[PDB]
Specification:
The structure is a homodimer of 93-residue chains.
Chain A lengths: L4 E3 L1 H11 L4 E6 L2 E9 L6 E11 L7 H6 L2 E8 L5 H5 L3
């Protein structure tokens, strides 16, 4: 799995500004259909990840499945600062 | 299932601003572990949904699984206007 990307509010605005192509719209889903944690071994011992799954209707796309797969997408979580570890604090952009 | 939320760039930015109120950071993940289209059935026929699962490391949190479950989160997708259906175009804010 990928590293953690934690953003200050301003760096999160910058990140968006950088990633928003001129002619795009943003489809937003808060429809979480599953959420859980799983472990995986790495070359540096066992780790834990959260998995959050979101649903959203396909009827808004005139696009096939692999096209929607290819589209730039992100999950975002709003986390109060009291709820970070030391590691989560070290990571803040 | 919730209806689709589709925002123009400016509406999308206004929407997120409303969440950046407190001592809050934003955890962002593009680590899609699973992506597919699946049919959903009801009494009045079938509808296709996309499902997007994202992973993010747990060790950044000082929080159990139910607490991460409870935090505000969204999947967002960046879509070319020329890739929307007529209904998707319809629903822009």
């Amino acid at each position: 799995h990928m590293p953690a990307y934690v953003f200050s509010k301003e760096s999160f605005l910058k990140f968006l500004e950088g990633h928003l192509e001129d002619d795009v719209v943003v489809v937003v889903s808060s429809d979480v259909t599953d959420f859980c944690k799983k472990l995986s071994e790495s070359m540096v011992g066992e780790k834990e990840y959260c998995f959050a799954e979101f649903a959203f209707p396909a009827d808004i796309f005139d696009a096939d499945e692999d096209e929607i797969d290819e589209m730039m997408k992100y999950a975002i979580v709003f986390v109060e600062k009291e709820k970070l570890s030391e590691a989560g604090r070290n990571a803040i952009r």
